[PDB]
Design a protein around this ligand. Structure first.
Ligand SMILES: Cc1cc2nc3c(=O)[nH]c(=O)nc-3n(C[C@H](O)[C@H](O)[C@H](O)COP(=O)(O)OP(=O)(O)OC[C@H]3O[C@@H](n4cnc5c(N)ncnc54)[C@H](O)[C@@H]3O)c2cc1C
Ligand SMILES: Cc1cc2nc3c(=O)[nH]c(=O)nc-3n(C[C@H](O)[C@H](O)[C@H](O)COP(=O)(O)OP(=O)(O)OC[C@H]3O[C@@H](n4cnc5c(N)ncnc54)[C@H](O)[C@@H]3O)c2cc1C
Lengths: 489, 489
């Protein structure tokens, strides 16, 4: 060797740590991993473990699980479970305490991971580039901060992920994002969620569960229908189900300005001219790659749309020895995707066995209440790219909801196929257990499954998933881009 | 035509109705369907819809769902849900009421199905054979009952299903089975479940949820480990988890005699010499095909082991125009299996397109708490039939159970493969959502999936199912029948 490190990883995230660990253990390389802090929390939020562990998937799901009990406690009544329901609210503070305990516990398991792994070291601070071989770790994000260390490396991996966009509106700084929501002292009584992304929807569901008495949550979106890019029938059925669960969904609406009332709350002026008071206002309107403070110009790494680091199918940047993975590349912003990209990177460069990450037919979930499980193409997209498209659809209400009272809780399955050969192009599910079911669906679609593979499989009874195997007749069709009730040419 | 009916179906069960409906609607045949009664209930229990609808899968799952709330209510505490927990018991009577409402609601939808379907008619009473073309519907099971009608038919389908075996022991008639359990006036305080089948386990879980104060349930099995035929590690981990949830599991034990105490309860003498009092004693020790009262001798249909109607891969009996499907054939006693066998029968005989039911790689579930999801071969079996077998194993505790308190709730996945080519021979799961996940696993295994298909699929995070895709290193091996740690050649 002529260099201090083989790899310097900028960001100890989902992708960062995965790569760093692999190079260190499986290929015995000298890896240095740079992240902002060691444990979760403000004012930096993200930490060792990345967004997912600290202010993402992990804490968000624990809170969804918590909020889910609201429905579950109500539903037990029909089964004979008698208890004082009127004026029953959960303790937000014990939830946040429970959550912090867990997240911090994961943070600490990482410290002793670094301590035990040889060749792997953690370097706390803000990283930035000097040249293709030099990463400077500064005291703060400010480019004139004290240089804490200078890392002389062979390879540089950028895995700094993304960051919430703001509204750019008079009184914008009075709002919170997903970051601050995780650390709220008290559960808001009058909550407003701006946005129509999965984050906006999942959080609306959390606050809806943890609101105090007389509390309510409004979901405000500037478009026609929430969750763009999802199955249209799924989006409409969820909007309907959020309504039934107490979330007031507002459409074609946008905050114009926010002014802070002298009692603490926030006065919000709207698109249509209306005015309302909210105890808290959360912005979930977009997440841009975190690359602006990396001095990428100095090393000459090309950043396209919104600062996204431009990469080929092997994550290589404009500079031959610099790489980038995960949310910073602005592809599919999911944890297991970043993990996969990081795994491929190591296999390619240090394993000598190149591999590109497969970005198509990736299954994902929305942890709304009820949850979404999706994998593949929406009918609208499939119809543009294929000659003949068959749409299968089935809605049903599980029998338990006759007893539970939650008659609004329809399970929905929609299968999208290429009619030519029967190949399944998309699977879209709404209802409980949807995230769990879709995972094994994604294995099938990876194997290039056909609709005949589904209905030939003997079902498991009684389950919600068994309805995948009972869809033979298509609901309708798409003949070269247009919706037809019947098929003939 | 020369005959009154094309098809007479003996039993309006899962398989019976499926066949009957198909012949009638898709092939416009004259179908007569014979079942004992129109709606569920004692003293006949089974009715229009079969065991599954009336005294099986459907009612059993509603009750499991009910009992599941016990854990869910306890678990909400950690998330901030405060309520009076000490001395909290569910109302068994409102559960049974809720159940009855649902089951009888399904019964009623069948009446109007018959009313609207042309060529399909229901004939209430006990059926029996006269010859290859004549089915007599009697007033009762007694062969000297009044003949209600004589059905002159082309084809006869036997789909009368199965019936619980008894203990054959002094005081046996003081015990109940699954049938009577569904109609108990009150939830027993001191409950005993005899057996180690899925039924025994699922019901133990139901009574454990609906027991009053100071109540308890004992599970008594005559063998070493409950649930023979299941993954050994799964069986042990469930035994451990039933224990942790309050069910006292007893092994190598058997009632010797039962005598009724004059206060109502039951005194039970055991195999080891012990004596105990139980408010109710349920036998779940086997289900034999219901064929003894069919006068099969008359028509000359061969009945092998325990009265099972002997059939080839197309369900054809010893008589060329008589057929039999479902539990009466004593193959795989599952609802969707019987449904499939019935569907195949119609396609073969009336559709002119023969098909045999695929009995291998059928996925099933056990709705215990926590539930089992299984599809394929156990390692013990796979090791006997294959050259080289690789065993993959992964246990983990979902993070939510740090908060919930249920630290005993490990999720377990065990994948069994043929090492030669990587083909997945078995998948065995323990934990919540296991029945739902396994369904889409069964599609994969039908397509002949390999272990490489699993870990190449990008995961859905955070879920329990995502752990299927993270099992690369085998735990150990089987080299031509024997357990080896690593593999030598
Ligand atoms: C509210 C929310 C919910 C989500 N839910 C899900 C979900 O359910 N499922 C799912 O798959 N994904 C989910 N995600 C997305 C997921 O968190 C990200 O896609 C994933 O973490 C991306 O991995 P990464 O390694 O690219 O970035 P990250 O995991 O975010 O890692 C980036 C790390 O780099 C550090 N960093 C930033 N700048 C510097 C610097 N200059 N120097 C050193 N270190 C730096 C940060 O501190 C951070 O820890 C969610 C995200 C959010 C915000
Ligand atoms: C407690 C319990 C739980 C179960 N849980 C599940 C589960 O979770 N999943 C699953 O897949 N399976 C489950 N099963 C098994 C499932 O119910 C059976 O395998 C299935 O119903 C068999 O279908 P079949 O058509 O062969 O018989 P059935 O559906 O039982 O139909 C038989 C019908 O024939 C009628 N009959 C009987 N004798 C005569 C006669 N001589 N003349 C006219 N009619 C007659 C009966 O009234 C009955 O309605 C469960 C069973 C039980 C007992």
């Amino acid at each position: 060797m002529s260099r201090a490190y083989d790899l310097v990883v900028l960001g100890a995230g989902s992708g960062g740590l995965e790569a760093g660990w692999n190079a260190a253990v499986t290929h015995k390389k000298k890896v240095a991993v740079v992240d902002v802090q060691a444990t979760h929390g403000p004012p930096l939020f993200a930490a060792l473990g990345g967004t997912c562990v600290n202010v993402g998937c992990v804490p968000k799901k624990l809170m969804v699980t918590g909020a889910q009990y609201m429905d579950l406690i109500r539903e037990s009544g029909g089964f004979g479970w008698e208890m004082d329901r009127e004026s029953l609210c959960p303790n937000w503070k014990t939830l946040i305490a429970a959550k912090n305990k867990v997240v911090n516990s994961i943070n600490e398991s990482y410290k002793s991971m670094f301590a035990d792994t040889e060749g792997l070291s953690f370097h706390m601070g803000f990283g930035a580039l000097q040249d293709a071989h030099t990463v400077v770790v500064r005291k703060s994000e400010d480019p004139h901060s004290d240089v804490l260390e200078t890392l002389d490396t062979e390879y540089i991996l950028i895995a700094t992920g993304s960051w919430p966009t703001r509204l750019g509106v008079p009184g914008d700084e009075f709002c919170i994002t997903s970051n601050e929501a995780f650390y709220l002292e008290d559960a808001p009584k009058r909550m407003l969620c701006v946005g129509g992304g999965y984050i906006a929807v999942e959080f609306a569901g959390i606050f809806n569960g943890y609101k105090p008495c007389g509390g309510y949550v409004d979901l405000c979106y500037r478009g026609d229908l929430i969750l763009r890019g999802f199955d249209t029938e799924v989006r409409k059925s969820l909007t309907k189900q959020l309504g039934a669960n107490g979330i007031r969904v507002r459409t074609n609406l946008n905050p114009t300005k926010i002014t802070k009332n002298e009692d603490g709350s926030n006065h919000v002026h709207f698109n249509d001219g209306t005015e309302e008071d909210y105890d808290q206002v959360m912005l979930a309107i977009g997440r841009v790659p975190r690359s602006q403070a990396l001095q990428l110009d100095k090393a000459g790494v090309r950043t396209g749309k919104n600062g996204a680091v431009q990469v080929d199918a092997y994550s290589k940047t404009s500079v031959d020895n610099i790489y980038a993975i995960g949310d910073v590349t602005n592809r599919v912003m999911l944890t297991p995707v970043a993990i996969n990209e990081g795994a491929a990177f190591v296999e390619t460069v240090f394993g000598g066995k190149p591999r590109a990450t497969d970005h198509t037919k990736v299954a994902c979930a929305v942890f709304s209440i009820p949850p979404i499980g999706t994998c593949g193409m929406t009918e609208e997209e499939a119809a543009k790219n294929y000659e003949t498209v068959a749409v299968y659809a089935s809605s049903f209400t599980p029998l338990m909801h006759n007893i539970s009272g939650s008659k609004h809780k329809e399970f929905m399955i929609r299968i999208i196929t290429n009619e030519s050969n029967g190949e399944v192009l998309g699977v879209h599910m709404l209802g409980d257990s949807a995230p769990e079911i879709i995972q094994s669906v994604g294995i099938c679609m990876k194997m290039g499954a056909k609709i005949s593979d589904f209905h030939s499989t003997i079902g498991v009874h009684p389950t919600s998933a068994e309805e995948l195997c009972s869809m033979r007749t298509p609901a309708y069709f798409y003949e070269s881009g247009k919706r037809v009730e019947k098929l003939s040419s």
